[PDB]
Amino acid sequence: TFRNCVAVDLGASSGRVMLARYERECRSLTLREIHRFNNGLHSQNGYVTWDVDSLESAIRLGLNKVCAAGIAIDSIGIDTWGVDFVLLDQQGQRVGLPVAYRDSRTNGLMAQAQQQLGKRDIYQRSGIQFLPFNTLYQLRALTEQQPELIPHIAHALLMPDYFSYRLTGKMNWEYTNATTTQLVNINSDDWDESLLAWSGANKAWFGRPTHPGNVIGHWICPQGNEIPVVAVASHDTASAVIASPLNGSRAAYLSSGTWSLMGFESQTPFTNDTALAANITNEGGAEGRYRVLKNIMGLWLLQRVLQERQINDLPALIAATQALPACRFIINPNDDRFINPDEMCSEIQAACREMAQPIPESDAELARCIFDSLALLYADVLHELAQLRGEDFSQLHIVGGGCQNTLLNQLCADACGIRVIAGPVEASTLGNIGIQLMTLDELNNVDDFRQVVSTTANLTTFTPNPDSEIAHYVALIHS
Numbered sequence: 001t002f003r004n005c006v007a008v009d010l011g012a013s014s015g016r017v018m019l020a021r022y023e024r025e026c027r028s029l030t031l032r033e034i035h036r037f038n039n040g041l042h043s044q045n046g047y048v049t050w051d052v053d054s055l056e057s058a059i060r061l062g063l064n065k066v067c068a069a070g071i072a073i074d075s076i077g078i079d080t081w082g083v084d085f086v087l088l089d090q091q092g093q094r095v096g097l098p099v100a101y102r103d104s105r106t107n108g109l110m111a112q113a114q115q116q117l118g119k120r121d122i123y124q125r126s127g128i129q130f131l132p133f134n135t136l137y138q139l140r141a142l143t144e145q146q147p148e149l150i151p152h153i154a155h156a157l158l159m160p161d162y163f164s165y166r167l168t169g170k171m172n173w174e175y176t177n178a179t180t181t182q183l184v185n186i187n188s189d190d191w192d193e194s195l196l197a198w199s200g201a202n203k204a205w206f207g208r209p210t211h212p213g214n215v216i217g218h219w220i221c222p223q224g225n226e227i228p229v230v231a232v233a234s235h236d237t238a239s240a241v242i243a244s245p246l247n248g249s250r251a252a253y254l255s256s257g258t259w260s261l262m263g264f265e266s267q268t269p270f271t272n273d274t275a276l277a278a279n280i281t282n283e284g285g286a287e288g289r290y291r292v293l294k295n296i297m298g299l300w301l302l303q304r305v306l307q308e309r310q311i312n313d314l315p316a317l318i319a320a321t322q323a324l325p326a327c328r329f330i331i332n333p334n335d336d337r338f339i340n341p342d343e344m345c346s347e348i349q350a351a352c353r354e355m356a357q358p359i360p361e362s363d364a365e366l367a368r369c370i371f372d373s374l375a376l377l378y379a380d381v382l383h384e385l386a387q388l389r390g391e392d393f394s395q396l397h398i399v400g401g402g403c404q405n406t407l408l409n410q411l412c413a414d415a416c417g418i419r420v421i422a423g424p425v426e427a428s429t430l431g432n433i434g435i436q437l438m439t440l441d442e443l444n445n446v447d448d449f450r451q452v453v454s455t456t457a458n459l460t461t462f463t464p465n466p467d468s469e470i471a472h473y474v475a476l477i478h479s
């Protein structure tokens with residue numbers, strides 16, 4: 001009577017196959033990691049790409065581990081990073097390369113679109129923030145730079161639907177992730193004609209976006225039995241918001257991983273002048289609850305400093321960084337220069353040096369710079385979001401792998417002057433499981449699920465410290 005649901009959660013920095021156990025009467029939700037594997041950017045033939053074949057094999061591995069365990073699997077669901085896509089021919093074979101959002105092929109194309117179509121217009125249609133790597137500009141890059149592929153393309157599937165197709169044989173176009181493309185019209189919940197036209201993409205490459213909960217198809221363990229594959233809120237960030245234990249209207253979330261996604265939930269989008277000027281997005285959510293958020297470059301900066309400096313002990317680095325004075329090195333992480341520079345440490349140091357600031361040179365200094373610069377931006381965005389909706393936030397829920405960074409959790413509380421609740425760590429996985437359970441009729445809605453999470457997950461509270469270094473700094477920048 002307990003249900004066994006599998007989440008496949010693929011991030012930019014890592015992928016995971018996880019198993020969850022749940023039953024209504026007990027209200028208990030347990031997560032088990034089945035298969036953890038690495039994901040990252042591969043330089044392939046002058047492009048920055050994803051190794052989709054290795055991921056699928058890794059996904060199959062994880063699933064086959066659950067079948068051979070002799071576990072009755074009630075459902076499977078896949079969530080990944082947004083924006084990206086895979087092209088398929090008439091037979092199902094991939095067309096072209098699976099290009100990552102970190103690729104430079106889109107450079108300049110966003111500016112061209114705002115010039116040709118109008119900044120206001122694209123925003124009124126999509127309600128999606130302008131990011132230079134949006135699918136709208138990715139498809140322009142493809143149609144302009146590779147026009148010999150066009151005739152072969154029959155279908156375009158976003159990453160999670162691609163992997164759902166590979167397991168089932170059935171194509172899906174999941175709503176919450178479809179919205180990350182800047183190609184869906186916010187008033188119709190279907191693909192925008194004019195935006196598709198500018199991108200050069202064909203409307204027939206896509207089906208009508210469908211809201212989370214439908215069964216895409218089925219997957220077969222090496223013995224026979226059918227396991228339903230559910231279209232979850234397939235955008236990883238959409239899943240993480242679902243699993244965030246939000247306490248009604250005045251709670252904000254920060255989905256913290258490679259990216260920091262800061263926002264709130266609304267039943268109505270914000271597409272006015274204030275939202276455009278602040279560059280807010282209205283990404284699709286479960287239940288039609290718009291995820292009104294902003295992208296913050298996030299721990300991507302730390303990830304890159306780790307590799308380049310050859311640091312294999314992150315907790316040790318964080319512990320040392322805590323001994324260093326706050327807010328002496330400040331950059332703007334959302335600067336385009338940080339999207340994918342060759343030398344991250346040099347970029348961060350160059351940016352500091354340009355502002356006549358002392359140069360962060362040690363490992364701890366570079367981490368200090370990153371954590372402090374993020375926390376100040378967290379503060380800025382939170383003010384921007386509260387000012388937009390005309391309402392304060394009582395608490396900030398930090399979820400994701402980044403929520404294990406207790407230093408950054410406290411810095412964020414202190415800079416934002418707000419109570420921080422950290423947890424759950426694997427929010428995307430949990431939200432993925434959450435939707436499956438509703439499809440199985442084990443769970444009634446998202447509010448139902450968030451109560452399970454808030455009485456199941458480990459939640460750590462961070463109280464904002466007014467006499468903190470970063471708090472001192474933030475009060476100073478007011479007058």
Ligand SMILES: Nc1ncnc2c1ncn2[C@@H]1O[C@H](COP(=O)(O)OP(=O)(O)O)[C@@H](O)[C@H]1O
Nearest residue numbers: 011012013014256257258299400401402404405
């Ligand atoms: N033990 C830890 N302490 C502090 N931070 C951590 C720890 N483990 C992971 N992180 C942070 O979490 C990030 C990855 O989080 P995750 O939500 O998995 O991101 P993504 O889904 O983008 O891969 C890492 O960049 C790292 O900074």
Ligand SMILES: OC[C@@H]1O[C@@](O)(CO)[C@H](O)[C@H]1O
Nearest residue numbers: 081082083101236237259295
């Ligand atoms: O797709 C690129 C970025 O990756 C995320 O999905 C988080 O992993 C963000 O929501 C999206 O803006």
